[PDB]
């Protein structure tokens, strides 16, 4: 399925869904990276930092 | 190299697949500049001179 | 919990079958706890804190809670903490900008990426000469693999070479361990700078100890193995490479050298200074004819390590402060190169020819900014942390040598030189015959390189923020009457 | 090019002031004016022409003087206004 | 801004022509007249004239393509060819 | 070294070219400049029937030594060429579709 | 008689993945060019420049600065020196 | 008359995201030193635990 779809995407420049092959690619877009990036690292450093000047 | 010539890569003066010099990095545009009006013992002479 | 969570590990392989999203989880939680770790530190006291020690003979699967301490020791204070903040915030960034390049055989090459991080991170933690040994040799034989398997063209002489210097080095800092094993009966950090050696042995302990710290910092002139290394190495590797592993030597300076051969390293110090002054110039010179994007990258970091080691070993408060505030600067920006040359441009083109490159500032705004911003903060432009710690770094060379550190000044020009040589080419003149146009910098590859920028500044505007970790060690290592 | 001479002919004159600032770090233990200043009238005088030689040199690089005026002419390149 | 034509190149090329003393007759200056045969221009001439003629669209020939005008029609297409004149 | 060939024609009148633009490059008084391409013409004409090998080639070295004494520093150029002052400026962009490098990632 | 067992069935090694578009267009002789540079080692011999470069960098420079590093040790103070006082120690 | 290209909204992802964080930040920094004026301590400080000196 994931070869299908981003083989797809990749070629056409069409993303698969809505169901044929629409070209909104205007947002609707997550990476499977974001979640992790943005929820868990990202407070942690901002953690950090406010850690570090309140430690100081 | 006279620039009103024809090259592949007019800015850089050089055609595909020309070879390079091993100092080419020495001898391409981005290298310093030359000055020709002058040999460079002579502008040496004029310069220590003034 | 290990138990569960092992058969957790087992289902997402099952039904997945990428380890990598277990692996971002898993370091990302990493970092979460050393912050915990970090608020419940006492800074008002120079003593090892959080300590544990494995493989005692009345436990040798668990902790020991012996009244004889015969096992490996871990601890940390201050100095160690920063590292390990550093190590932390790097790993899941490792991870990170190889989510899509790595497509054949990829669960292995995240193993290797996420062992040698924790590997890393271990040996921040290591108490005593040979738990610090054990870990400081264990991330060669991953790194000799990874390189190996998953490297450019000339990656079989790169692992060779990663795996034959690091060696070499090392063996010799193992004689100094053993003789300091054999004459103190003892190995451990806390309590051996109670220990003094009569000058001629700390003379001779200090010379294996010292060539160690000459592979592995790098120093001229046996540096010649580092650009190899980092040009064929894959991105990962060499983010590791340049912003961690190089900086267990700095901090082998301060940890097993400093404290215990204080007399031997009096008498040492103009030799040091020798060395990393040419280091310093020799290195940066020689970058001003390479070809290779990620060559030049790699031989900026030399020159950098000869600046902290001049401010390491300067005898003085500001010099080691700098020291440290330059290796995490370091860390924080090299990495970010790397990125951009091996991560960026060799995805997109797969070639590292100097030649090939010229004005991607028209298709390419974003990325130009990008190299245009870690440009001037690789030669240390002020508010950055390298220019704080390299500022610092000479202001101690200078005190404990005027003429050495005086003359060290000229590394501002020169590293300016080869950097701004570089990006001048990179950015400027209409965009290149050789190469066609792609898409410009990701989100993923922006969200990495801010991160990194954004730390960098933060300790640049503020670099104080770092000294309540800090303030015992400024003082722990000078050796004045 | 143009730009890339003057920034590193500025970044000479940027390495003799790191140069006249660690000399001044280490002498009156302060980059202050109040405190230099203040005290500069009792400084050796060696030490003062260190100082103040490095300061020159950046400040000859940054007014174009006869050492390092080269990049002031290149500078042209640049927009008018610039 | 400013913009010529290829008339407005050729009317140039052709007062410039007028103006030329050397010249056998005014009247008989072509957009297709050939300076070496119709006009009788000697051969350090037609070089004084390709240099009046960058010398009034403010550009630059090389020598190769200098001595390759032979006609005015030449001059016209080559000053008409070149986008900053 | 002929006497009259059209590589001597191309050279001379190249030759020619060339010192009536090093003429214009040495003096800034229009009519001096008249003046001296004047001459220039003048002494060009004088030496155009030289048969004999010997004297041509000579007259031909002494005067690529005369120009190459006469040689300006700076020519003038117009803006737009090489060595102008607005050469390639505002270079337009080569018109260009993205290729793509990666499956899953722009 | 001697053979791999029957039972093993072997087929090709493919690393997979999408064959991208060329984005680089592969020029020969800058790609000679960087192989020279890369591989200078393997090449390298002991003539008279080379000689005096090593000599220059790996002897000569070095002394100079041993020299200037052994003499100056200890010999400056400068932290709050007043006029008359010597900034020398010896 | 300049030409017109399309209109672009103002507020993007990118401006949303670091302005709302850095002005979060100085209001957490305003609100832990009221905080401190009125309790007698930064409200930061209370979740600092390290283990006493002795
Ligand atoms: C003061 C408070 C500031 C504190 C920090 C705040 C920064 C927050 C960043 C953020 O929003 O999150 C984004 C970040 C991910 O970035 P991203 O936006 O998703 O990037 C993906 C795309 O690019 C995003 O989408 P895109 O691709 O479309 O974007 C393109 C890209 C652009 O493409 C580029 O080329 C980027 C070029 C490089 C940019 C990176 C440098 C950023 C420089 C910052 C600005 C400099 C300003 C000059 C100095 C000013 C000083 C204030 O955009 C950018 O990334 C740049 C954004 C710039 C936004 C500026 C606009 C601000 C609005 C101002 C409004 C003012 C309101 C006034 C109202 C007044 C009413 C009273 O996620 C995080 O939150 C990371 C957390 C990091 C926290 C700081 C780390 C601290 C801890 C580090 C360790 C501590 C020290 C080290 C210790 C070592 C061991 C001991
Ligand atoms: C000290 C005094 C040394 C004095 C000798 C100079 C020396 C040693 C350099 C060692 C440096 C060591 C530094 C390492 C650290 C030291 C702590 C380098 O002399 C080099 O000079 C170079 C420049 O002139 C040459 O480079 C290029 O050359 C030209 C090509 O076109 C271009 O003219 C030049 O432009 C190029 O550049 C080299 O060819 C030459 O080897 C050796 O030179 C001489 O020694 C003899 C005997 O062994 C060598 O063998 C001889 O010739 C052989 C067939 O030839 C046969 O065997 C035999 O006939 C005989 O045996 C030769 O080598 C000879 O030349
Ligand atoms: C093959 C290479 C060579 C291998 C030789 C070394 C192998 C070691 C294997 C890794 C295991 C070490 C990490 C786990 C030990 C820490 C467990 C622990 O509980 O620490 C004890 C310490 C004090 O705890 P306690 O006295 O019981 O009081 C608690 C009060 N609530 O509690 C604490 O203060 C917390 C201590 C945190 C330490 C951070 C550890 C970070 C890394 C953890 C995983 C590393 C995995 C490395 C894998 C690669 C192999 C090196
Ligand atoms: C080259 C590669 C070389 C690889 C080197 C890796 C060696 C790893 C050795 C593992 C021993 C170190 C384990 C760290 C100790 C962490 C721990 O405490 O685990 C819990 C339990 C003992 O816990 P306890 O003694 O009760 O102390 C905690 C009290 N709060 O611990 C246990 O119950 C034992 C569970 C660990 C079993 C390990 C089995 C070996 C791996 C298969
Ligand atoms: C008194 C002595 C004064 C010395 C001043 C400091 C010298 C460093 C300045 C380097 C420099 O500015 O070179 C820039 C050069 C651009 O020059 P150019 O090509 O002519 O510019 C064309 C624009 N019209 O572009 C380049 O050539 C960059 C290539 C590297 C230039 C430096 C090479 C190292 C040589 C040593 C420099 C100085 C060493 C320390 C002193
Ligand atoms: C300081 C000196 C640095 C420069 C000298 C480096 C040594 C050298 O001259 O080259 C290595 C040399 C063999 O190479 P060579 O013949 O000299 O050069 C080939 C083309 N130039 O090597 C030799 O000359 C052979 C010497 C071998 C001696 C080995 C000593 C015992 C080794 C451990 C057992």
Redesign the interface.
Same mark, same amino acid.
């Given at each position: 399925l994931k070869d299908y779809y981003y083989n797809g995407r990749r070629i056409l420049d069409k993303i698969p869904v809505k169901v044929t092959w629409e070209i909104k690619r205007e947002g609707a877009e997550k990476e499977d990276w974001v979640n992790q990036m943005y929820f868990l690292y990202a407070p942690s450093l901002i953690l950090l930092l406010i850690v570090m000047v309140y430690k100081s | 190299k006279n620039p009103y010539k024809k090259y592949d890569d007019q800015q850089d003066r050089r055609n595909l697949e020309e070879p390079l010099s091993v100092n080419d990095d020495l001898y391409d545009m981005w290298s310093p500049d030359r000055f020709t009006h002058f040999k460079n013992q002579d502008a040496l002479k004029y310069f220590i001179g003034f | 919990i290990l138990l569960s969570s092992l058969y957790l590990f087992n289902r997402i392989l099952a039904w997945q079958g990428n380890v990598k999203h277990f692996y971002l989880f898993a370091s990302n939680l990493l970092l979460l706890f050393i912050v915990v770790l970090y608020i419940n530190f006492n800074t008002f006291s120079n003593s090892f804190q959080f300590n544990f020690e494995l493989f005692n003979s009345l436990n040798p699967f668990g902790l020991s809670n012996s009244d004889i301490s015969n096992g490996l020791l871990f601890g940390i204070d201050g100095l160690s903490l920063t590292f390990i903040l550093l190590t932390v915030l790097l790993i899941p960034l490792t991870l990170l900008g190889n989510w899509y390049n790595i497509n054949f055989n990829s669960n292995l090459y995240y193993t290797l990426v996420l062992a040698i991080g924790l590997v890393i991170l271990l040996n921040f933690w290591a108490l005593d000469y040979i738990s610090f040994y054990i870990l400081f040799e264990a991330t060669l034989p991953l790194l000799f693999i990874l390189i190996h398997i998953y490297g450019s063209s000339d990656s079989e002489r790169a692992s060779f070479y990663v795996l034959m210097f690091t060696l070499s080095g090392s063996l010799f800092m193992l004689l100094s361990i053993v003789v300091i094993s054999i004459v103190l009966n003892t190995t451990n950090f806390i309590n051996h700078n109670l220990f003094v050696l009569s000058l001629d042995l700390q003379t001779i302990i200090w010379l294996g100890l010292f060539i160690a710290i000459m592979v592995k910092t790098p120093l001229f002139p046996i540096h010649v193995w580092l650009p190899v290394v980092h040009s064929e190495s894959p991105l990962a590797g060499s983010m590791i490479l340049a912003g961690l592993i190089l900086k267990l030597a700095l901090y082998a300076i301060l940890r097993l050298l400093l404290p215990l051969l204080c007399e031997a390293q009096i008498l040492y110090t103009p030799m040091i200074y020798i060395i990393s002054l040419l280091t310093i110039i020799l290195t940066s010179l020689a970058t001003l004819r390479q070809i290779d994007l990620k060559v030049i990258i790699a031989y900026s970091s030399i020159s950098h390590m000869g600046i902290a080691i001049l401010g390491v070993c300067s005898n003085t408060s500001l010099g080691i402060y700098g020291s440290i505030v330059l290796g995490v600067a370091h860390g924080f920006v090299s990495p970010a190169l790397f990125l951009i040359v091996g991560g960026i441009l060799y995805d997109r083109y797969h070639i590292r020819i100097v030649n090939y490159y010229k004005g991607l500032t028209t298709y390419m705004p974003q990325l130009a900014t990008y190299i245009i911003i870690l440009s001037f903060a690789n030669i240390g432009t002020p508010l950055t942390g390298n220019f704080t710690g390299e500022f610092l770094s000479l202001q101690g060379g200078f005190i404990r040598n005027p003429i050495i550190g005086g003359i060290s000044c000229i590394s501002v020009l020169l590293a300016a030189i080869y950097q701004l040589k570089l990006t001048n080419k990179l950015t400027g003149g209409i965009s290149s015959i050789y190469m066609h146009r792609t898409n410009d910098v990701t989100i993923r590859e922006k969200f990495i390189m801010n991160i990194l920028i954004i730390s960098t500044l933060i300790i640049g505007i503020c670099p104080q923020i770092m000294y309540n970790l800090l303030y015992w060690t400024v003082n722990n290592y000078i050796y004045i009457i | 090019?143009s730009?890339?001479s003057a #920034? +590193?002919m500025n970044? !000479?004159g940027?390495? !003799?002031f #790191? +140069?006249g $600032?660690? #000399?001044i770090?280490?002498? !009156?233990?302060t980059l202050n004016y109040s405190t230099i200043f203040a005290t500069a009238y $009792?400084?050796?005088?060696? +030490?003062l022409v260190l100082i103040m030689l490095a300061l020159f040199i950046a400040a000859m690089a940054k007014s174009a003087q006869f050492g390092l005026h080269n990049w002031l002419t290149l500078a042209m390149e640049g927009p008018t206004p610039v | 801004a400013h913009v010529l034509t290829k008339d407005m190149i050729q009317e140039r090329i052709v007062a410039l022509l007028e103006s030329f003393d050397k010249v056998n007759d005014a009247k008989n200056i072509t957009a297709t007249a050939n300076l070496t045969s119709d006009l009788g221009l000697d051969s350090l001439d037609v070089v004084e004239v390709v240099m009046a003629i960058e010398e009034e669209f403010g550009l630059e020939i090389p020598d190769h393509d200098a001595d390759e005008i032979k006609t005015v029609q030449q001059a016209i297409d080559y000053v008409s060819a070149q986008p900053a004149a | 070294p002929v006497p009259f060939s059209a590589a001597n024609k191309k050279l001379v009148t190249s030759m020619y070219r060339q010192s009536l633009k090093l003429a214009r490059n040495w003096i800034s008084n229009r009519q001096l400049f008249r003046q001296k391409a004047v001459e220039i013409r003048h002494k060009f004409d004088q030496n155009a029937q030289i048969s004999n090998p010997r004297l041509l080639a000579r007259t031909l070295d002494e005067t690529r030594a005369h120009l190459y004494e006469f040689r300006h520093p700076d020519p003038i150029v117009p803006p737009s060429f090489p060595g102008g002052t607005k050469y390639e400026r505002n270079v337009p962009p080569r018109m260009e579709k993205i290729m793509q490098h990666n499956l899953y990632e722009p | 008689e001697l053979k791999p067992s029957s039972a093993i069935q072997r087929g090709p090694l493919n690393k997979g993945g999408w064959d991208a578009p060329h984005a680089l267009h592969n020029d020969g002789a800058i790609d000679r060019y960087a192989h020279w540079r890369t591989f200078y080692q393997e090449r390298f011999k002991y003539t008279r420049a080379t000689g005096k470069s090593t000599l220059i960098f790996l002897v000569a420079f070095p002394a100079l600065i041993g020299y200037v590093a052994y003499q100056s040790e200890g010999l400056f103070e400068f932290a709050g020196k007043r006029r008359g006082e010597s900034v020398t120690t010896r | 008359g300049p030409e017109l290209t399309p209109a672009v909204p103002f507020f993007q992802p990118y401006v949303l995201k670091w302005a709302g964080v850095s002005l979060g930040l100085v209001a957490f920094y305003q609100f832990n030193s009221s905080y401190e004026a009125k309790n007698g301590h930064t409200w930061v400080e209370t979740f600092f635990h390290p283990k006493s000196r002795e």
């Open positions: - | - | - | 090019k730009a890339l #920034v +590193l970044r !000479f940027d390495a !003799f #790191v +140069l $600032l660690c #000399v770090a280490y002498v !009156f233990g $009792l400084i050796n005088t060696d +030490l | - | - | - | -």
